[PDB]
Amino acid sequence: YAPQKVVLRNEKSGYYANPDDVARRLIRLISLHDKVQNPSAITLKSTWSEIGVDPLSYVEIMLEAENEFYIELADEDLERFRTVEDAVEFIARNFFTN
Amino acid sequence: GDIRHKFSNEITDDDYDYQRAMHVKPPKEESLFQLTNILSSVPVFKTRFFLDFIARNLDTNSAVSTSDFVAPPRVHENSFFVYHSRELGNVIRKYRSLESIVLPGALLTFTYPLFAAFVAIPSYYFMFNAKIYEMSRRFVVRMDVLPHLEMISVQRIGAFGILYTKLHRIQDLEYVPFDQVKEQENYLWAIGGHGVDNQLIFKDRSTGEFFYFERQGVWDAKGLNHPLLN
Amino acid sequence: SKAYYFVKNFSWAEVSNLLCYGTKYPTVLNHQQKVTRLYRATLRRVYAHQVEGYKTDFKQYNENITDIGKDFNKMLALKPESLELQAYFKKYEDLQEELFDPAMIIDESRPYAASSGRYYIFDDYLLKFDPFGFYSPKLLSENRPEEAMPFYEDYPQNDSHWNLWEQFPEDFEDSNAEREAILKSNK
Amino acid sequence: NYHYDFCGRAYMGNPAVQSPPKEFFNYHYVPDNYPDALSGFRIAYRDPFEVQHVFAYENWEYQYDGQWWSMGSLACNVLFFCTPLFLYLILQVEELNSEKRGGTSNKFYHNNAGFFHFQIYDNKQ
Amino acid sequence: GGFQKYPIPRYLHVGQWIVNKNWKWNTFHMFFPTAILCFMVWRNSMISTAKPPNYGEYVDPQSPVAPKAIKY
Amino acid sequence: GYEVHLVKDKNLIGNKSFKDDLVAVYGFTDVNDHHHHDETDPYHHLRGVPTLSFERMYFADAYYHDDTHEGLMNEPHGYLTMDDPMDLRPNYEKSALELLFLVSGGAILALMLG
Numbered sequence: 026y027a028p029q030k031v032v033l034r035n036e037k038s039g040y041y042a043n044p045d046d047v048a049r050r051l052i053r054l055i056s057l058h059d060k061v062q063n064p065s066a067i068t069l070k071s072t073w074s075e076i077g078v079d080p081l082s083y084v085e086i087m088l089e090a091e092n093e094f095y096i097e098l099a100d101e102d103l104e105r106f107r108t109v110e111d112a113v114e115f116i117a118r119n120f121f122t123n
Numbered sequence: 124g125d126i127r128h129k130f131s132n133e134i135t136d137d138d139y140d141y142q143r144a145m146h147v148k149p150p151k152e153e154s155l156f157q158l159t160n161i162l163s164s165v166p167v168f169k170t171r172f173f174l175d176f177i178a179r180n181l182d183t184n185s186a187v188s189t190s191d192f193v194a195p196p197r198v199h200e201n202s203f204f205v206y207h208s209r210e211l212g213n214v215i216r217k218y219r220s221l222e223s224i225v226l227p228g229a230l231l232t233f234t235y236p237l238f239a240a241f242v243a244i245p246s247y248y249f250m251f252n253a254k255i256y257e258m259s260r261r262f263v264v265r266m267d268v269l270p271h272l273e274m275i276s277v278q279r280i281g282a283f284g285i286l287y288t289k290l291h292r293i294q295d296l297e298y299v300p301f302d303q304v305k306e307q308e309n310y311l312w313a314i315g316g317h318g319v320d321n322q323l324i325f326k327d328r329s330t331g332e333f334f335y336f337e338r339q340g341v342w343d344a345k346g347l348n349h350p351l352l353n
Numbered sequence: 354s355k356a357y358y359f360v361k362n363f364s365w366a367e368v369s370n371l372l373c374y375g376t377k378y379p380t381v382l383n384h385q386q387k388v389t390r391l392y393r394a395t396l397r398r399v400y401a402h403q404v405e406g407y408k409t410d411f412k413q414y415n416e417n418i419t420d421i422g423k424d425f426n427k428m429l430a431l432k433p434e435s436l437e438l439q440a441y442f443k444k445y446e447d448l449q450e451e452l453f454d455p456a457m458i459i460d461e462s463r464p465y466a467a468s469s470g471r472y473y474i475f476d477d478y479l480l481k482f483d484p485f486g487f488y489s490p491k492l493l494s495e496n497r498p499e500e501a502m503p504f505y506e507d508y509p510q511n512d513s514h515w516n517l518w519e520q521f522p523e524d525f526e527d528s529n530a531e532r533e534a535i536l537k538s539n540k
Numbered sequence: 541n542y543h544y545d546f547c548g549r550a551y552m553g554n555p556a557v558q559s560p561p562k563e564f565f566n567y568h569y570v571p572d573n574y575p576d577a578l579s580g581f582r583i584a585y586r587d588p589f590e591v592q593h594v595f596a597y598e599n600w601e602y603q604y605d606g607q608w609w610s611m612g613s614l615a616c617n618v619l620f621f622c623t624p625l626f627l628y629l630i631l632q633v634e635e636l637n638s639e640k641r642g643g644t645s646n647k648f649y650h651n652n653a654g655f656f657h658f659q660i661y662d663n664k665q
Numbered sequence: 666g667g668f669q670k671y672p673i674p675r676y677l678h679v680g681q682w683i684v685n686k687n688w689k690w691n692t693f694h695m696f697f698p699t700a701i702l703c704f705m706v707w708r709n710s711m712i713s714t715a716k717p718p719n720y721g722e723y724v725d726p727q728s729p730v731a732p733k734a735i736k737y
Numbered sequence: 738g739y740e741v742h743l744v745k746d747k748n749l750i751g752n753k754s755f756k757d758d759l760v761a762v763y764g765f766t767d768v769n770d771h772h773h774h775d776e777t778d779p780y781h782h783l784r785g786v787p788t789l790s791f792e793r794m795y796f797a798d799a800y801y802h803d804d805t806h807e808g809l810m811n812e813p814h815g816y817l818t819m820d821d822p823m824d825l826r827p828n829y830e831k832s833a834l835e836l837l838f839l840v841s842g843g844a845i846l847a848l849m850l851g
């Protein structure tokens with residue numbers, strides 16, 4: 026039961042989902058793609074172009090990421106994403122129910 | 124990951140065995156009332172009488188295919204086969220054969236043949252004609268090539284399962300893209316065109332007749348590579 | 354996406370723009386943004402109708418998405434000011450209109466969706482708020498005075514002025530004892 | 541169907557985003573007014589658009605003579621204008637039925653000779 | 666299944682996820698007195714209840730209970 | 738202790754390629770992984786509980802938290818009205834309204850009822 030004393034919102038860590046698991050699942054999804062050649066070279070700091078994701082392949086990967094993570098990502102957020110780091114950060118910090 | 128063993132009163136696979144009827148798992152043990160157990164236990168089935176009955180009175184091994192290469196009998200002494208339909212052809216044959224038993228039988232048995240016909244008419248025109256009948260009419264049971272005529276003989280299933288062969292000139296064959304016919308015959312392809320290949324439709328320009336080839340049909344490499352067809 | 358297509362009195366053109374591209378004014382978008390957003394919208398709609406649909410055919414879904422992908426690759430290659438690219442955009446906008454489904458599934462993670470705002474989350478201001486001292490202790494001195502300000506009582510939550518004159522116990526002793534003692538000493 | 545571009549004469553707020561209004565009518569209080577201090581006397585800053593909407597209707601006015609008839613829909617405006625006449629004519633037509641039948645008619649009946657409802661009528665010695 | 670629980674201000678008298686420790690005694694002292702009140706209402710109303718005759722009973726037209734027309 | 742173990746600047750999948758390695762059969766290998774074997778028991782609340790109970794009948798979910806342990810289950814709370822429980826004002830508005838109610842009820846009982 027909640028104590029009779031005043032308790033404030035506890036933002037433990039900005040991530041609502043395990044960021045490590047989110048990053049690993051996203052990297053596996055990216056590696057599944059045909060254009061992606063070396064899964065080893067993919068890191069959170071790696072840009073989409075350098076890992077080999079074309080602008081058109083990016084939207085496909087992001088749609089499948091939405092399906093995998095049970096969320097919908099706005100075009101503005103998807104265009105703002107510049108690295109796997111930003112992608113995983115946004116997904117992990119996203120409250121799946123908005 | 125499973126922690127059922129940590130509790131003495133937790134459910135067990137012995138408790139889940141009853142779900143094997145509704146759930147598919149590899150066999151674990153044979154019950155006393157299984158067909159296999161009954162046959163292997165009861166000495167009656169071991170009798171040579173029953174064994175010989177099993178050996179003779181059932182589907183024969185002769186009709187069983189024995190290789191991945193099939194050379195059906197030539198239609199003409201100079202022709203060579205190219206395409207042949209295995210399963211959908213037999214299914215269509217057996218379906219159209221019903222018109223030789225159900226129809227006369229319906230006439231001689233039903234109290235109200237007119238009622239049966241009145242029910243069948245709209246049934247044929249919706250959900251049956253496009254479903255099976257038109258596809259069967261345009262279905263190619265077999266295709267051979269006669270080189271001396273430079274023609275192709277196509278075998279088709281007719282009314283009551285009758286098989287008839289027709290000749291078409293190779294110069295009159297054209298490829299009809301599926302885009303040109305999808306809108307015209309959406310219903311046909313919607314409910315009945317699944318068996319035949321959508322992107323491998325041909326037609327005879329002179330007679331305006333289509334040719335549907337089964338997806339699970341056998342093609343001959345030599346027949347395809349023959350210069351007449353290339 | 355805010356998923357407010359059927360609310361706020363959008364016209365059909367505005368709704369079509371919202372569906373095809375995230376914006377209601379696609380002119381502001383550049384070539385790459387237009388192409389990528391239209392490709393994403395087309396893939397989303399094809400997935401909705403041919404994967405999560407009525408007796409969906411996965412082989413047909415694969416063929417359709419492959420054709421769409423080839424077409425959109427060609428569109429991206431094409432220059433922005435080309436009638437061919439305009440024709441491609443019109444074709445796929447028409448496809449989006451054709452596949453438009455009233456009461457289409459809206460994910461619960463998007464704004465304005467069903468169940469979007471079922472709960473009101475209380476802020477730390479409300480959580481801290483406690484004018485009476487039952488939950489958060491209340492000083493007898495209502496507030497803590499700050500330097501450079503006078504010491505004033507906090508405004509009460511209830512400001513009713515239906516107050517009597519101050520009440521005292523019956524037979525309350527109130528004689529001016531200090532004055533009496535000083536006068537007695539003075540004599 | 542109603543859209544801002546094609547409404548023409550059925551006015552409504554435009555959908556295009558606009559900058560906040562610099563000047564707008566605001567709440568004003570009588571001089572030396574006693575402030576209202578309920579629930580701790582906490583006052584929030586008012587939204588300019590909301591305040592503008594609050595005070596817009598009170599100050600709205602017709603620009604030119606005769607604009608009222610044209611504004612909105614002429615047919616509906618005329619019907620609203622004639623509504624009292626329609627009500628009076630309906631009442632008279634209904635009263636025709638009362639006259640021909642014998643039921644209640646629209647009149648100030650005077651059954652009581654000025655005797656009010658349950659009034660105390662007494663005299664003094 | 667349900668939504669994630671979030672803090673509710675103490676000062677606010679709201680029903681979000683309210684569970685009472687003494688709910689058993691509260692139910693006991695809210696049920697029986699209500700039952701007694703309804704029993705009193707029921708016995709008061711039964712005085713003005715009407716039922717048709719039973720299976721083996723017929724209404725005599727001249728009996729007082731039988732309906733009577735107004736006598737001018 | 739809310740710091741998160743997240744690996745950056747280092748690869749997370751050790752497979753050189755999807756085709757050469759039979760990933761479709763053996764999946765992806767993990768590198769720099771923070772393995773944490775969690776054996777939390779679902780239905781712990783159900784363990785040793787009678788069938789006819791709220792926990793079994795309604796709250797028999799995987800990871801249900803009991804009220805005694807759930808920190809966000811609320812007991813009755815809040816102030817009924819805006820009046821301060823400890824107020825030093827000799828305010829009489831509440832007494833006046835209570836008197837009005839009581840006198841109205843008494844007048845009905847003693848003059849009108851029956």
Ligand SMILES: CCCCCCCCCCCCCCCCCC(=O)OC[C@H](COP(=O)([O-])OCC(O)COP(=O)([O-])OC[C@@H](COC(=O)CCCCCCCCCCCCCCCCC)OC(=O)CCCCCCCCCCCCCCCCC)OC(=O)CCCCCCCCCCCCCCCCC
Pocket residue numbers: 550612613614615616619626
């Ligand atoms: C006296 C004898 C009676 C008995 C005989 C039989 C009845 C005859 C009655 C007369 C009918 C023909 C004349 C009507 C013409 C239209 C009105 C008019 O002139 O105003 C200018 C007219 C209207 O301007 P506006 O209203 O500012 O335009 C708004 C915009 O369109 C933007 O609009 P929006 O998109 O915002 O939508 C708003 C729309 C829709 O609005 C709504 O949805 C809200 C509801 C509106 C009212 C709908 C009618 C409800 C019932 C009314 C009952 C009245 C009872 C009291 C009066 C009793 C009188 C006996 O508002 C309108 O309705 C506007 C259209 C015009 C009014 C139509 C309704 C009233 C007409 C009169 C009916 C009289 C009935 C009498 C009998 C009753 C039974 C005993 O302007 C135009 O010309 C523009 C086009 C408008 C559409 C015209 C459609 C065709 C009408 C017929 C054309 C041919 C007429 C030939 C006449 C020949 C000589 C007699």
Ligand SMILES: CCCCCCCCCCCCCCCCCC(=O)OC[C@H](COP(=O)([O-])OCC[N+](C)(C)C)OC(=O)CCCCCCCCCCCCCCCCC
Pocket residue numbers: 220222223224226227228229230231283284285286
């Ligand atoms: C207003 C006017 C109304 C008119 C309504 C008309 C309704 C009546 C329609 C009559 C349809 C007649 C159909 C003829 C079928 C044969 C056509 C044909 O040539 O096909 C050859 C086909 C194909 O011939 P084939 O030469 O290709 O090959 C021979 C057969 N196979 C393929 C196996 C090698 O052969 C047959 O199907 C033979 C059928 C023989 C039996 C026919 C009668 C069966 C029903 C008997 C009565 C009902 C059962 C009674 C049981 C009693 C028990 C005690």
Ligand SMILES: CCCCCCCCCCCCCCCCCC(=O)OC[C@H](COP(=O)([O-])OCC[N+](C)(C)C)OC(=O)CCCCCCCCCCCCCCCCC
Pocket residue numbers: 225226229230232233234235236237238239240242243246
């Ligand atoms: C006279 C011209 C030729 C007419 C040919 C006959 C119609 C076309 C072929 C119909 C074949 C299917 C016959 C199914 C018989 C089922 C048993 C029966 O009720 O027969 C007697 C009845 C009629 O016998 P009856 O007339 O003595 O019955 C008494 C009359 N009633 C029933 C109206 C009260 O059969 C029928 O009603 C058949 C109606 C026509 C069906 C047309 C095709 C639609 C069905 C597709 C095939 C599968 C149907 C499976 C049904 C299973 C049971 C619900």
Ligand SMILES: CCCCCCCCCCCCCCCCCC(=O)OC[C@H](COP(=O)([O-])OCC[N+](C)(C)C)OC(=O)CCCCCCCCCCCCCCCCC
Pocket residue numbers: 626629630632633
């Ligand atoms: C959506 C449904 C709508 C239903 C219709 C709603 C009402 C429509 C309008 C009804 C008009 C009725 C007019 C007749 C009644 C006159 C009453 C009267 O005595 O007033 C005299 C009044 C004065 O009345 P007064 O009060 O001085 O009378 C003296 C007092 N008494 C009578 C008691 C002795 O004189 C007028 O000014 C009348 C002007 C009339 C102008 C022309 C009106 C024409 C209306 C035509 C309507 C269309 C035809 C009918 C349609 C329906 C058919 C079923």
Ligand SMILES: CCCCCCCCCCCCCCCCCC(=O)OC[C@H](COP(=O)([O-])OCC[N+](C)(C)C)OC(=O)CCCCCCCCCCCCCCCCC
Pocket residue numbers: 678679680681
């Ligand atoms: C002498 C005979 C018997 C005498 C009894 C007379 C009873 C008279 C009627 C009493 C009504 C009491 C309503 C209490 C509402 C309390 C607040 C609440 O429920 O939550 C509000 C909820 C949430 O409240 P909350 O959770 O924020 O706060 C609860 C605690 N308070 C209010 C103190 C802060 O808010 C709403 O959404 C409003 C819902 C209102 C629902 C009202 C439904 C009434 C249905 C009654 C049906 C009766 C049938 C009668 C049939 C016979 C007719 C002749």
Ligand SMILES: CCCCCCCCCCCCCCCCCC(=O)OC[C@H](COP(=O)(O)OCCN)OC(=O)CCCCCCCCCCCCCCCCC
Pocket residue numbers: 689692693696789790791792794
């Ligand atoms: C015919 C076959 C029918 C088969 C039905 C099969 C099931 C159908 C589906 C279920 C529907 C009913 C579900 C009822 C669940 C009851 C659960 C329960 O009783 O749990 C025990 C609980 C003890 O309290 P506690 O454990 O603290 O509660 C919090 C738990 N988280 O609480 C209790 O002990 C309950 C008692 C609490 C105290 C009650 C005090 C008295 C209340 C008024 C009683 C009035 C009786 C009037 C009788 C009139 C007779 C004329």
Ligand SMILES: CCCCCCCCCCCCCCCC(=O)OC[C@H](COP(=O)(O)O)OC(=O)CCCCCCCCCCCCCCC
Pocket residue numbers: 221222226240243244246247251256260281282283
């Ligand atoms: C009044 C008629 C009542 C019904 C009569 C039924 C007769 C059935 C026997 C038909 C024998 C001749 C078939 C000719 C085929 C051909 O080549 O047909 C070719 C014809 C002519 O070609 P097109 O019309 O396509 O141009 O095609 C037709 O569509 C017209 C004939 C239709 C015959 C349909 C027969 C099947 C009926 C099925 C009923 C519903 C299902 C019942 C349960 C299985």
Ligand SMILES: Nc1ncnc2c1ncn2[C@@H]1O[C@H](COP(=O)(O)OP(=O)(O)O)[C@@H](O)[C@H]1O
Pocket residue numbers: 361362363553554555556
């Ligand atoms: N006061 C308003 N007046 C007219 N149209 C409005 C008004 N408010 C919203 N709209 C409509 O709301 C839609 C915009 O919704 P909004 O919540 O502002 O999100 P955003 O502006 O980011 O698209 C527009 O169609 C706009 O026309």
